[PDB]
């Protein structure tokens, strides 16, 4: 039922999964060391049945090749460039974008590159300036793995379990183990160095609807900090919290997460939204 295909891009060969939905398009961007396969509940469920869900693999991840040029590609802004190129190749200029973790940071960098984006939802993602990483994220061993090049077998399992939450599945180890570890190291260094656009300022000034949805028991993200971030156009006027979920509510609590995602897509595609400047 899922349409799997591969695109030759300037960054390398990028794997793409598409649902069968005939409705407005949604780009879902996976997180650090993950893959678009993680979005099975949306791809194969009611979201993907109605809307055209597009879930690619970032360069160095999943079934995509490693980046032709790691120095160009492995950064929040480089990934944003790659996803923008993917969408252009697919002929889709006005997707709603959902980004998970790293994918949410990528979505923020895409705002400048993809101006007809109809909305952005970020989950597991604190918009932070480089100097705010400590405020936005919780410190710990799995957080530290996010920027570590070489994963042992234990690291793979630890990172998979913590980032993906309940339930753990063996297939997650294959996804995380595949990841080009250079991508972790280089992206995290460039994030801390602010090589791309300041994400705090970007979300404050962005005019499109931005939705914020997180699991209450987030082990990586400081939810209080997130609830205080200034957004230009915060969807439904607040950040949203789902009980009995952590870093990955789209798989830990799919029904509740999907209620938010479906309503957000409906709003972004069915209501008027101006740009007053």
φ, ψ for residue 108, nearest 5 deg: -60, -45
The four Cα atoms 46, 47, 48, 54 give a dihedral, to 10 degrees, of: -160
In angstroms, what is the resolution? 1.4
CB 34 within 8 A of CB 163: yes
Please, which experimental method was used? X-ray
The four Cα atoms 165, 168, 170, 171 give a dihedral, to 10 degrees, of: -50
Looking at the chain, which runs of residues are DSSP E strands?
A: 3-9, 12-18, 23-29, 51-56, 96-100, 119-123, 210-215, 240-242
Strands 51-56 and 12-18: antiparallel
CATH of 1-277, one of 3.40.50.1820, 1.10.10.10, 3.90.1570.30, 3.40.640.10: 3.40.50.1820
Whole-number Å distance between alpha carbons of 192 and 244: 31
Q: Nearest CA to 61 among 218, 172, 210?
A: 172
Domain range annotation of the chain: 1-277
């Amino acid at each position: 039922t899922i349409n799997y295909h591969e695109l030759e891009t300037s960054h390398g060969r990028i794997a793409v999964r598409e649902s069968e939905g005939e409705g407005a398009p949604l780009l879902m961007i996976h997180g650090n060391s993950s893959s678009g396969a993680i979005f099975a509940p949306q791809l194969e469920g009611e979201i993907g049945k109605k809307w055209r869900v597009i879930a690619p693999d970032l360069p160095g991840h999943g079934k995509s090749t490693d980046a032709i040029d790691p120095d160009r590609s492995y950064s929040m802004e480089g990934y944003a460039d790659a996803m923008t190129e993917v969408m252009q190749q697919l002929g889709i200029a006005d997707a709603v974008v959902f980004g998970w973790g790293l994918g949410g940071h990528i979505g923020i960098e895409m705002i400048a590159r993809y101006p007809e984006m109809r909305g952005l939802m970020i989950t597991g993602t604190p918009p932070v300036a480089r100097e705010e990483v400590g405020q936005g994220f919780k410190s710990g061993p799995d957080m530290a793995l996010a920027g570590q090049e070489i994963f042992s077998e234990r690291d793979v399992e630890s990172y998979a379990r913590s980032t993906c939450g309940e339930p753990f599945e063996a297939s997650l180890l294959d996804i995380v183990a595949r990841t080009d570890g250079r991508a972790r190291r280089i992206m995290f260094e460039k994030f801390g160095s602010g090589t791309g656009g300041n994400q705090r300022d970007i979300v404050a000034e962005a005019q499109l609807p931005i939705a914020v949805v997180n699991g209450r028991d987030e082990p990586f993200v400081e939810l209080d900090f997130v609830s205080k971030v200034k957004f230009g156009n915060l969807w439904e006027g607040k950040t949203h919290v789902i009980d009995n979920a952590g870093h990955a509510p789209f798989r830990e609590a799919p029904a509740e997460f999907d209620a938010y995602l479906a309503r957000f897509i409906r709003d972004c595609t069915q209501l008027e939204h101006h740009h007053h400047h």
